[PDB]
Design goal:
Two copies of one chain form a homodimer. Chain A is mostly beta strands. Chain A has six domains: 6-151, 24 nucleotide stem-loop, u2 snrnp hairpin iv. U2 a', Chain A, CATH 3.80.20.20; 247-294, Hormone Receptor, Insulin-like Growth Factor Receptor 1, Chain A, domain 2 (Hormone Receptor, Insulin-like Growth Factor Receptor 1, Chain A domain 2, Ribbon), CATH 2.10.220; 329-460, 24 nucleotide stem-loop, u2 snrnp hairpin iv. U2 a', Chain A (Alpha-Beta Horseshoe), CATH 3.80.20.20; 465-507 and 521-529 and 537-580, Immunoglobulins (Immunoglobulin-like), CATH 2.60.40; 591-696, Sandwich (Immunoglobulin-like), CATH 2.60.40; 711-797, Immunoglobulin-like, CATH 2.60.40.10. Chain A contains five helices and 51 strands. In chain A, the strands form 15 sheets. The first copy, chain A, has a six-stranded parallel sheet, with no helix packed on it. In chain A, strands 1-3-5-7-9 form a five-stranded parallel sheet, with no helix packed on it. Chain B binds two DNA strands through residues 12, 14-15, 34, 36-37, 39-41, 64-65, 67, 86, 88-89, 97, 99, 469, 471, 476, 478, 480, 538, 540, 542, 544, 546-547. Chains A, B: The modification Phosphotyrosine is found at residue 366.
Chain lengths: 799, 799
DNA sequence: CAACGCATGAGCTAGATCCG
DNA sequence: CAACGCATGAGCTAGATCCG
């Protein structure tokens, strides 16, 4: 037979060898097999136990913390395939922290459908590299076999298997010292094979009896049907867990077995696409008689039979199933004890609930203020009741002030009784208008819901306050609202301004409860104003707040305060919030004005936007000034040690950019650059303070040097006067001429004529002149640097 | 007469000149006279009033924001002296933005006691350079008269006063065009004077009618007594404001005038060393009848008779003017109807009171978790009783959780009845506890304290719980306590465990009236234990907690929990709080290791205490490493552009300090400095990671330059070889020799010899040396900088 | 009779319908 | 018979007398 044995559910084994005895006649195990934590076991009570008739594995096998095993092949001698239907710990088969196992001996395994193997912290195993996972494990890139006895080549590795050359070496792969890993010709990869190499039926695997037969081999691929198995059997039967196809009359009765809410390992199995699947996916709803899934027109419920029909919920873990679980056949109970933030998690998990049939109970609430997370709820059937016939319950909750927004919500109760006791944070108004929309109208207990233990410590109010005038500056906001007096005007404590910035308008609404929050609305108290007894008076109260960054959206309102007294009046008033931004003074200074000059006529200035823009800046205002050189540097003797070498005003309204280039300016001249960041211009023209920077553009290559006829006059005392021309537009200013003369065969003897010396003499002179042929050359050394050399003027003075 | 007028208290004028009329007959002003805020005033209402009787000033005279005064001389024609008792922002007399004032007219000031004059922003004043303040103001170094009408010399400045030459100019000092500044001969600087210049009595000032008489002049220096004044008056009278002396019967009445707490600007005047000082200084306490300040052995009270023997301090302020009060002579009623946070403020405000005489009524508390703020209360006398002879009263307190810790507290009530009603979360044992510790044992009412309306809505558990073996680690503590079972061991819910760290032991008990505060005892619930039906069993339950910090004290206790029931039984049990500190470990890293170099052989290093000590750190472990220079810099041609210029291993157990210097080290080398903060050492020697910094000390003055016999060898080709020696201990390293040779009549031409060139040649050569007398001088330029120059070695090479 | 004048704008003097 | 062994120590496997 393919599988002549019996079905066998997955099961867990710990702390005893007693509960393994339930594997006497099992052949195929659905689920997984976990056996672990086995310390006080003599090793020799394992040699006399085995499970030969067990073949198939669906999910996984695990071995962890065993004291006494040496070779599990004595217990698992015919095991061939792991289906790997579920990945556990991102792995399939794991042997961890073994203490006594010498050799593995899984000599019968052929294929791993899905998953990976992992053997760790086992300093007693050998032949771990004689495995060839690639043949068995279709995916090897995740195999993790480290920190074992094979950390050092010290365990033998001797065995009598073709010794494949899958790697670069002629490695021999064996299971034990008495078992190799059988390999036949690979004409068929995963379709079963014989010892003689003859391939068996394509749709079966493992060891084989007769080739090309899907009925007498061992294990097959797709499904199973009564000694046969085909890729897809005809739909008189429906497929089950990708391993069978059997008639729905059986799994319908399985659905009827634990439809009694007794165990949570069950699933409300449903037929869909000829699959008795646990749940037909989203966008589908259930039917009563035909056991199919209707495509669920709209976001309709699917369904969900509550645990024990009375299950309580205390955390998100106790509400994980609610995703998809929409119609509830039980009584819900909620009690969060502590918690940090669940108001953003319930909607993603239970914001899709519409119908419950039991009764709802709330107690010991700590960190909740509303019931808005209950989005799609519409009705409670109340087939089961609390003691005293209560369809709803609410005791000892000290933080709830809100249930639903009944201007847009609708709930109905079929029957039962309401409970509201010791909920001191919710006014009588809400629960009375709970009764308006709820099914009950006069069904009260007497003593019904507590009328004194609830809402006593928090004074509810249904009164509003409106504003009268608002003025804003860039930094200060002028607030003013209408006056108000309580029915007893002396009974009044003042006003509080709760205010902060709000870049959006999705701001949290005020609830009157103080939790441990770092972020809180800064608030100031306002002295109640003088009583004027005049309707036409200055009784309108207000306040001016000044510590505000400009152009930020601020949410503001004002809340009254009055003492609590015996009479249930003077509830005060509460003003709704409004949004206000500031005014638009001149922005802050422009930041980082960077000036760069690359050529003699180009200067680029780039800045950074002002730190405080004070609104949308319309433009930028730039200004430049042509600086002047020093007049003190004209009268220095520049052949003495020490020489210098440096590197209305027109404007534009530069807009919509961050840099500006200015040309048509004097070359090699200092330029003081200033820019004012400036807001909207035509009304109330005000700009920032100018960020001042200095800039000097590049000099000109020819400006330093001067060309012209350098003439000479020879005096009688052999003192030759020299006449030439100065640079009309030098690079900054001429400071020194590098005048020099040369005899043929004589070096460049240079002389000095100062800027003033050239000015007073209109040239220079060469006293004590040797008779001969001299060439006079002049270099115009500007403060920007030395210029070019003039033409060496030839003149011969003879003996 | 000397001082024939009337005493006149300091007074202020604003927005109306009406109240100035109270200066009709007072000639001496105590305090200060402020005149300010006069906008809508015609200038014509001023020439009809004057004050020819007032002379002296104590604090300061201030004229500010007046619209219409052009000459204040029409109001102050005779006053001459100002004492400046209290500095007005470190000044004495100010005119500050006066708009109508043409001429000041202070033609009568004689002398300045202390302070400064300041005249500002007056574009209508002249003659301000004609004052000669140096003759009247004792301290000129702080005069500030800027930005006035005489910022420009444009107002005339003519006057008919000897034209003093105090400065380098013949400055003519005049007050007005009709009055100059009067100066008589300076034989006596401040001993009074007449028009003819002869000096009057030594102890008086300014004007004078008959000379050399303390009774026949106008104003004197030290004191005053019935038309006379002496340096120290006889002690039948006692000095007042160091300018009079009056009988004790006078200022005892001043003490008794505002012993009635009506105005807070006065003081309870006391006598000390012939001074009716407002308060005898710290460490001195008054006596009742004598009004003398006892030397106050040890701490002494300020004493606080309650206002009208009855007060209802309820809020933050209430009667906040009571800091320092210790004993109260009335009765108090406290009621904080809400509030934000006062727990951290009462101790600094009222946390020093010990005794009250009346009764205490407490009601409507909302944020009062305990009464530990009443730190020093010891006894209640009960002079006034509430209706029904009630001394203690508690009513409708939803957050008064606890009263006191009697193990470290003692309170006694002499008489009266105690009231405690409708406080629904405070149990029955502690009110018995305060009953037994207090005087009363059987003074009850029928009905006395409510036995049901209190502690019913909270699971009060005061019944006994004791712990068992406890175990602790560096991070975790193992807990276990004695088993408890209610009289019905079926009615139960389990345990909850509150904990929080505490650097001290003045921690509030968990005490159970729900106050949602920012800081609260974080709690974990416990599954109630199994029933074993054996007294000798494992019934002791425990718990493991891990999220803790090492070396930190933590308070812990356990509490039972049970379902509510109609029967008043199964009250459960509760444990007392205990302290168990966590264990120490390695400290944190040493912080901010700062190394400073002051000499070549001293290197000081200072650090900061580690952030986490983890126990009492016994010492600090320090180490260092001798860094080496870079060997790659030896083969660099330093004459080319680019030069560099910088600025087991032994140890010691540095203890009980923050810095330590290291001596005995080589000159100018880098050092790697590492220091470990470390806890107790001889057992479990564990220290943290070392804080690593670097340090290089300064070089040696002479180590850079080398001295020695610099001999030379002249070759046949006029190429002279140079022989000299290298510095044995260069500062860091020698890198280049600044070799140079200078012929007479020629410049000191410099040549080059590299570090390796000097190595391969043991010197340098001079190729192309013209015949002459040459002086060779070398400067040893190391990486630490240039050394000294050698001697220019004279050698003569001939033609 | 519906911003500015007749200060400044949160540094021992009061606190923006604050004032007209 | 009163820490350690025949794990680790809060990352889908249990939660420190937790197993002797």
């Amino acid at each position: 037979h393919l599988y002549p044995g019996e079905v066998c559910p997955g099961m867990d084994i710990r702390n005893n060898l007693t509960r393994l005895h339930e594997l006497e006649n099992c052949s195929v195990i659905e689920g997984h097999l976990q056996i672990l934590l086995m310390f006080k076991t003599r090793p020799e009570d394992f040699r006399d136990l085995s499970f030969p008739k067990l073949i198939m594995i669906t999910d996984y096998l695990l071995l962890f913390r065993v004291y006494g095993l040496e070779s599990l092949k004595d217990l698992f001698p015919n095991l061939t395939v792991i289906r790997g239907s579920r990945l556990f710990f991102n792995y399939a088969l794991v042997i961890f922290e073994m203490v006594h196992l010498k050799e593995l001996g899984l000599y019968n395994l052929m294929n791993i459908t899905r998953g990976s193997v992992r053997i760790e912290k086992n300093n007693e195993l050998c032949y771990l590299a004689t495995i060839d996972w690639s043949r068995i494990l279709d995916s090897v890139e995740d195999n993790h076999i480290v920190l074992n006895k094979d950390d050092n080549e010290e365990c033998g590795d001797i065995c009598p298997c073709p010794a494949t050359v899958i790697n670069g070496q002629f490695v021999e792969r064996c299971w034990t010292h008495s078992h190799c890993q059988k390999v036949c010709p690979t004409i068929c990869k995963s379709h079963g094979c014989t010892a003689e190499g003859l391939c068996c039926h394509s749709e079966c695997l493992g060891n084989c009896s007769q080739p090309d037969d899907p009925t007498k081999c061992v294990a097959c691929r797709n499904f199973y049907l009564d000694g046969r198995c085909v890729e897809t059997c005809p739909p008189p039967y429906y497929h089950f867990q990708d391993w069978r196809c059997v008639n729905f009359s059986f799994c319908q009765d399985l659905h009827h077995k634990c439809k009694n809410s007794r165990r949570q390992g069950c699933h409300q199995y449903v037929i869909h696409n000829n699959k008795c699947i646990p749940e037909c996916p989203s966008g589908y709803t259930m039917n009563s008689s035909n056991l199919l899934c209707t495509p669920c027109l709209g976001p309709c419920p699917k369904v969900c039979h509550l645990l024990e029909g009375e299950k309580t919920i205390d955390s998100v873990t106790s509400a994980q199933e609610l995703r998809g679980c929409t119609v509830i056949n039980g009584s819900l109970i909620i009690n969060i004890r502590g918690g940090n933030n669940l108001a953003a998690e319930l909607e993603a998990n239970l914001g899709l609930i519409e119908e419950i049939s039991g009764y709802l109970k709330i107690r010991r609430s700590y960190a909740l203020v509303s019931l808005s997370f209950f989005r799609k709820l519409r009705l409670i059937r109340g087939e089961t009741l609390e003691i005293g016939n209560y369809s709803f319950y609410a005791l000892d909750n000290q933080n709830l002030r809100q249930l639903w927004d009944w201007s847009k919500h609708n709930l109905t109760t079929t029957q039962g009784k309401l409970f509201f006791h010791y909920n001191p944070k919710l006014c009588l108004s809400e629960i009375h208008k709970m009764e308006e929309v709820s099914g009950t109208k006069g069904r009260q207990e007497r003593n019904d819901i507590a009328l004194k233990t609830n809402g006593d410590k928090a004074s509810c109010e249904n009164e509003l306050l409106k504003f009268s005038y608002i003025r804003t500056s860039f930094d200060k906001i002028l607030l003013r609202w209408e006056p108000y007096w309580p029915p007893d005007f002396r009974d009044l404590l003042g006003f509080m301004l709760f205010y902060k910035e709000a870049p959006y308008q999705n701001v949290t609404e005020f609830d009157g409860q103080d939790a441990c929050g770092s972020n809180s609305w800064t608030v100031v108290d306002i002295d109640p104003p003088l009583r004027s007894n005049d309707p036409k008076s200055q009784n309108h109260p207000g306040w001016l707040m000044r510590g505000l960054k400009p152009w930020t959206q601020y949410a503001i309102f004002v809340k009254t305060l009055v003492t609590f007294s015996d009479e249930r009046r003077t509830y005060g008033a509460k003003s709704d919030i409004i949004y206000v931004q500031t005014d638009a003074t001149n922005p802050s200074v422009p930041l980082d004005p960077i000036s760069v000059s690359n050529s003699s006529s180009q200067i680029i200035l780039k800045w950074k936007p002002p730190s405080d823009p004070n609104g949308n800046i319309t433009h930028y205002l730039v200004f430049w000034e042509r600086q002047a050189e020093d007049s003190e540097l004209f009268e220095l003797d520049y052949c003495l040690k020490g020489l210098k070498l440096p590197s209305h005003r027109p404007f534009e309204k530069v807009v919509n950019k961050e840099s500006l280039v200015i040309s048509g300016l004097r070359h090699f001249t200092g330029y003081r650059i200033e820019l004012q960041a400036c807001n909207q211009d035509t009304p109330e023209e005000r700009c920032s303070v100018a960020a001042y920077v200095s800039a000097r553009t590049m000099p000109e290559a020819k400006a330093d040097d001067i060309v012209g006829p350098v003439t000479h006059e020879i005096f009688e005392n052999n003192v030759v006067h020299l006449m030439w021309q100065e640079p009309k537009e030098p690079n900054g200013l001429i400071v020194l001429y590098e005048v020099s003369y040369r005899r043929y065969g004589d070096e460049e003897l240079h002389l000095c004529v100062s800027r003033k010396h050239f000015a007073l003499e209109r040239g220079c002179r060469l006293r004590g002149l040797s008779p001969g042929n001299y060439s006079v050359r002049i270099r115009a050394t500007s403060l920007a640097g030395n210029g070019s050399w003039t033409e060496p003027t030839y003149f011969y003075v003879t003996d």
